[PDB]
Design a protein around this ligand. Structure first.
Ligand SMILES: CC(C)N1CCN(Cc2cnc(-c3cc(-c4cccc5[nH]ccc45)cc4[nH]ncc34)o2)CC1
Length: 856
C-alpha cells in the first residue's frame, strides 16, 4: 500500500514513470536500481540513528564565512513561548555562551533553578531552516555576518535536543591471447533521410576518450535509400588484445556528392567487463562528424531515429572478459627504471613544471618512475603520453597508478576530464576527491553532475560518491536533485538522471515529499505564467496583474504556492504568499515576481522569487556560480568586494527561479530622473548619486559610496575575466546600501574579446561627484588589480571547472576556443609583473573609453 504510493510519488517527482525503466528489460538498468536502492536504504538507516547534533549537520549544515572585540545586539527566545530577551553580546562569543546567557534570563523570569545546561540546545535562526552551533564565534556565521553589515539585529530561538530528535524521528523512511585485427560487420542502415542526388558514407573511429586508438575507417559509397545495405567488413589497425577497457566504437553516417546526418557510439566491453558479440542495433542521434564525447546509449525515439545494424564478431569460442586488476598489476610489475643524466633530468623538470613534442612525450614515458616519486602532481601529463592502444603500456601505467599517492582536490578535478576515461584513473580521481568538504563539494557540484554525462556506464564511482554525500547532507541532496530534475527533457540524459533521482528518493522518503511540494508550486507557476503571457497580449498590465491575483487567490493556488522550502535555498522558507505584492516583468517571456512573508521570521521572511519560463537559465547560473567562487577566493585572501551572490536555479525545460534582491533597482530606472522624487537631478550624472544620498542620509553616504566602489571593482573584474557583454543600465542593479550587481546574462566568453569596461556614471560615484578625485579613483584601480591578481593564482581552478562544463550542452561553451578566452583574460601564460602590466594597459584603455563621456 505504501510501497505503491512511494513508487507513483517518485514517478511524478522525477517526471518519468518507474514502469518505463522495467519496460526496457536492460540488465544494466536492473542492476543499478537494485545495487543503488540497497546503498541508499543503508544510508537512510544510518541516519535515523545519528545523534541530535549529528542530525543538525545533515539537515541544517552550517553556513560559515569563507574565513571561518565589537558590541552586538541579539534577540533570543524559546520554542514554546512568544516571550523573547535582547542580549548585548560580542562577535567573538561562541553560540554556547549565548545559550548559557539565554537560559540565565529564563531562570530569573520563571524563578526555577533551570535543570538545562547550554550544551543540551541549538540556536535556530527565526523562521529559517538555519542553525548556529559548533565552536565558531558569532561573526564566523553567514547570518550574523550579513546582520553586521545591514545593521539589523539577529533573531534566534532556543531549540532543545529532544525537539531536534522529534524531527529526526518524524522524518523517518583471455583477451591478451587474441592478436587478430579488431573488425566489425556493417550490415545495414535503416530509416535514413537524405538527398537522392547523393551517396551514404559510414565513418567509424575507435577512441579512448578524446584520443584515437587507430586511424578512422570509411565504408564504401552506397546510393541514398531509407534502408541502405552494406554487409561489409571494416578492419581497424589495432589487435583485439590491445583494445583498452574504456574503448568506444564511434559511428558517423553522412551524405556525399560533407553532409552530416546522424552519429552513434557504443562501449566495446559491457558493464560486466565482457567484450561484446552478436548483432547490434544502434539507434542514431542527429548531427549538427565522428563524436567520441557523445553518449554510448541509443536514441530512445526508436520510431523516428535512424538505426544502423552492425555485427561484433566472435573473437573466441567462449566469452571474453577484460583481464582482472591482479593480471594487470602482474604484467605491469615488470620493466626498467628511470636511469638518465642530470641534463635530461633538467629538461624533464622544465617540461613537468611548465602541450609537448613527440620526443618530449618519449622522455615523460621513459622517466615514469621519477614522475611517480618526484613529480606526483604531474600524473595527468603522464596519462596523456601513455599509449592507450598498447596493452603492455596501459598495464605499466596502471601499476604505477595503484601505488600513486593521493593528489590535491585541484589535480583530482582535472582527472575527471573526458581526457582520462579509464575507470581505475577515475576511481583514483574520486579517492583524491573524498577529502572535499561539504562546502567545497557544493561549490563544484554543478560541474560534477555534468561529468555524469561523460560516464560510460550507470553504476560508476562518481554516482555512488555523489549519492553518498547527498544522503549525508540535505542541502547537497537538494541541489543534486534539481540539477538532475532540470535535464529530464533531454533524451540523452533522462534515463541516467531518472535512475539517480529514484535511488536518492529511496534514501530520503521525507525529502522526496518536501521536493514534491516544490514541484507542485513550480507546476502552478508555469500555468500562471502561461495565463499572464496570453492575457498580456489582450489587455492592459493593471488588468492582467489583477486577474493573475484572482487566479492566485484560488484554493488550489493558495495551497500549492505556500509553505514550502525554496528551490533556490532550502534554508529559505516561503511561507505566506503576498498576492498583492506579486506581479510580472514586461520582457518577452513575462517573468513572474512572487513575494512571500512569514511572521515567525519577521523581516527575514520577507522574500521573493522570480519565475521565468521560455528562456534558458543554465548560463546565468554558471556565470553567477563563477562570480560567487571569485568572491569566495577573494574573501579567503581578506578581500571583501561586497558582492551580491543571489540564487539562480534552472528547474525544467527553459524553466527556473531567480532570487529577488529587495531594496535594489536598475541603473536604468534610477536614471529615468522622474519628477516629484527625492533623487530628481539638475544633471543626469547626479541621479545615481542623489538616489544614493536619498537612501543613505548623513554619515551613511560614505559607506554607500564605498560599498559601490568595492562591488564595482569586483563586477568590472568578474565581467572582464568571464567576458560578459551586452552590459547596459537595464541589466546593472544598485542596492540601497550602495552595492552594485549584474542581472540577465545572455552572452559570456566573448561570443568576441569583450574589453574591460569602465563607465563614467559609476566613476562619477567613485569620485564622490567630483570631476577629479585621484584619491578615490586610484583606490578603486587598486581594488581592481588586487582582485584580478587573486583570480590568476587560481587560474587552473577556473580552467579545470570550465573544462568539466563542456559536457553541459551550452552553445557558448562547446570547444577549446572558449577555454582559451579564460587563459587570455587571466593572462595565464605571463608572469604576475607581465599580466599586471597587460591589465593596466586594458584598464587605462577602459578609462580613455570612459573619458569620451567625460569630454562630452
Ligand atoms: C515589483 C516591483 C516593485 N519591482 C520590480 C523589479 N524592479 C527592479 C528589477 C528589475 N529587474 C530586476 C531583477 C531581475 C533579475 C533577473 C531577470 C532575468 C534574468 C536574470 N538572470 C539573473 C538575474 C535575472 C533578477 C533579480 N533579482 N532581484 C531583482 C532582479 O529587478 C524593482 C521594482
Amino acid at each position: 500500500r505504501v510501497k505503491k504510493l512511494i513508487n507513483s510519488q517518485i514517478s511524478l517527482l522525477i517526471g518519468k514513470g518507474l514502469h518505463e525503466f522495467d519496460s526496457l528489460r536492460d540488465p544494466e538498468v536492473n542492476d543499478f536500481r537494485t545495487k543503488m536502492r540497497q546503498f541508499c536504504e543503508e544510508a537512510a538507516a544510518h541516519r535515523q540513528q545519528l545523534g541530535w547534533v549529528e542530525w543538525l549537520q545533515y539537515s541544517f549544515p552550517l553556513q560559515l564565512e569563507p574565513s571561518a572585540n565589537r558590541a552586538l545586539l541579539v534577540n533570543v527566545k524559546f520554542e514554546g513561548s512568544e516571550e523573547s530577551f535582547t542580549f548585548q553580546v560580542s562577535t567573538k562569543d561562541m553560540p554556547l555562551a549565548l545559550m548559557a546567557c539565554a537560559l540565565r534570563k529564563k531562570a530569573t523570569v520563571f524563578r526555577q533553578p533551570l535543570v538545562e545546561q547550554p550544551e543540551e540546545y541549538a540556536l535556530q535562526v527565526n523562521g529559517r531552516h538555519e542553525y548556529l552551533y559548533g565552536n565558531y564565534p558569532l561573526c564566523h556565521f553567514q547570518y550574523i555576518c550579513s546582520c553586521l553589515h545591514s545593521g539589523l539585529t539577529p533573531h534566534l530561538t532556543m531549540v532543545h535536543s529532544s525537539s531536534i530528535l522529534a524531527m529526526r524521528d518524524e522524518q523517518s523512511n583471455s583477451l591478451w591471447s587474441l592478436e587478430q585485427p579488431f573488425s566489425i560487420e556493417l550490415i545495414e542502415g535503416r530509416k535514413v533521410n537524405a538527398d537522392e542526388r547523393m551517396k551514404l558514407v559510414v565513418q567509424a573511429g575507435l577512441f579512448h576518450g578524446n584520443e584515437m586508438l587507430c586511424k578512422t575507417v570509411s565504408s564504401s559509397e552506397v546510393n541514398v535509400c531509407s534502408e541502405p545495405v552494406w554487409k561489409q567488413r571494416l578492419e581497424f589497425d589495432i589487435s583485439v588484445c590491445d583494445l583498452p577497457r574504456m574503448a568506444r566504437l564511434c559511428f558517423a553516417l553522412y551524405a556525399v556528392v560533407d553532409c552530416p546526418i546522424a552519429w552513434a557510439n557504443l562501449m566495446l566491453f559491457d558493464y560486466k567487463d565482457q567484450l561484446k558479440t552478436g548483432e547490434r542495433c544502434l539507434y542514431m542521434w542527429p548531427s549538427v562528424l565522428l563524436n567520441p564525447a557523445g553518449t554510448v546509449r541509443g536514441n530512445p525515439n526508436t520510431e523516428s531515429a535512424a538505426a544502423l545494424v552492425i555485427y561484433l564478431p566472435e573473437v573466441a569460442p567462449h566469452p571474453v572478459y577484460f583481464p582482472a586488476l591482479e593480471k594487470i598489476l602482474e604484467l605491469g610489475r615488470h620493466g626498467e627504471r628511470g636511469r638518465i643524466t642530470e641534463e635530461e633530468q633538467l629538461q624533464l623538470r622544465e617540461i613537468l613544471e611548465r602541450e609537448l613534442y613527440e620526443h618530449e612525450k618519449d622522455l615523460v614515458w621513459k622517466m615514469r618512475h621519477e614522475v611517480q616519486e618526484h613529480f606526483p602532481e604531474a600524473l595527468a601529463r603522464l596519462l596523456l603520453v601513455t599509449k592507450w592502444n598498447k596493452h603492455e603500456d596501459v598495464a605499466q601505467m596502471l601499476y604505477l597508478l595503484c601505488s600513486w599517492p593521493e593528489l590535491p582536490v585541484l589535480s583530482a578535478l582535472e582527472l575527471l576530464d573526458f581526457s582520462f576515461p579509464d575507470c581505475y584513473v577515475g576511481s583514483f580521481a574520486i579517492k583524491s576527491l573524498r577529502k572535499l568538504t561539504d562546502d567545497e563539494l557544493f561549490q563544484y557540484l554543478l560541474q560534477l553532475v555534468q561529468v555524469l554525462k561523460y560516464e560510460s556506464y550507470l553504476d560508476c564511482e562518481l554516482t555512488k560518491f555523489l549519492l553518498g554525500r547527498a544522503l549525508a547532507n540535505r542541502k547537497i541532496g537538494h541541489f543534486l536533485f534539481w540539477h538532475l530534475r532540470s535535464e529530464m527533457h533531454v533524451p540523452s540524459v533522462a534515463l541516467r538522471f531518472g535512475l539517480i533521482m529514484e535511488a536518492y528518493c529511496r534514501g530520503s522518503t521525507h525529502h522526496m515529499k518536501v521536493l514534491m511540494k516544490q514541484g507542485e508550486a513550480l507546476s502552478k507557476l508555469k500555468a500562471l505564467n502561461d495565463f499572464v503571457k496570453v492575457s498580456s497580449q489582450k489587455t492592459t498590465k493593471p488588468q492582467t496583474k489583477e486577474m493573475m491575483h484572482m487566479c492566485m487567490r484560488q484554493e488550489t493556488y493558495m495551497e500549492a504556492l505556500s509553505h514550502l522550502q525554496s528551490p533556490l535555498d532550502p534554508s529559505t522558507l516561503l511561507e505566506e504568499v503576498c498576492v498583492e505584492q506579486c506581479t510580472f516583468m514586461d520582457s518577452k517571456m513575462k517573468p513572474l515576481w512572487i513575494m512571500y512573508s512569514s511572521e515567525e521570521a519577521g523581516s527575514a521572511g520577507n522574500v521573493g522569487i522570480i519565475f521565468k519560463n521560455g528562456d534558458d537559465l543554465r548560463q546565468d547560473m554558471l556565470t553567477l556560480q563563477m562570480i560567487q567562487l571569485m568572491d569566495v577566493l577573494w574573501k579567503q585572501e581578506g578581500l571583501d568586494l561586497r558582492m551580491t551572490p543571489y540564487g539562480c536555479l534552472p528547474t525544467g525545460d527553459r524553466t527556473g527561479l531567480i532570487e529577488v534582491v529587495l531594496h535594489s533597482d536598475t541603473i536604468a530606472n534610477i536614471q529615468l530622473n522622474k519628477s516629484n522624487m527625492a533623487a530628481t537631478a539638475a544633471f543626469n550624472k547626479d541621479a545615481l548619486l542623489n538616489w544614493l544620498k536619498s537612501k543613505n542620509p548623513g554619515e551613511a553616504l560614505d559607506r554607500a559610496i564605498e560599498e559601490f566602489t568595492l562591488s564595482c571593482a569586483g563586477y568590472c573584474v568578474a565581467t572582464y575575466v568571464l567576458g560578459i557583454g551586452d552590459r547596459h543600465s537595464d541589466n546593472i542593479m544598485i542596492r540601497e546600501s550602495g552595492q552594485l550587481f549584474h542581472i540577465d546574462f545572455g552572452h559570456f566568453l566573448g561570443n568576441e574579446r569583450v574589453p574591460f569596461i569602465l563607465t563614467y556614471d559609476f566613476v562619477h560615484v567613485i569620485q564622490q561627484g567630483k570631476t577629479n578625485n585621484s584619491e578615490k579613483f586610484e583606490r578603486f584601480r587598486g581594488y581592481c588589480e588586487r582582485a584580478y591578481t587573486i583570480l590568476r593564482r587560481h587560474g587552473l581552478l577556473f580552467l579545470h571547472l570550465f573544462a568539466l562544463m563542456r559536457a553541459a550542452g551550452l552553445p557558448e561553451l562547446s570547444c577549446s576556443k572558449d577555454i582559451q578566452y579564460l587563459k587570455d583574460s587571466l593572462a595565464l601564460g605571463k608572469t604576475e609583473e607581465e599580466a599586471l602590466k597587460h591589465f593596466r594597459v586594458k584598464f587605462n584603455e577602459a578609462l580613455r573609453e570612459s573619458w569620451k563621456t567625460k569630454v562630452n
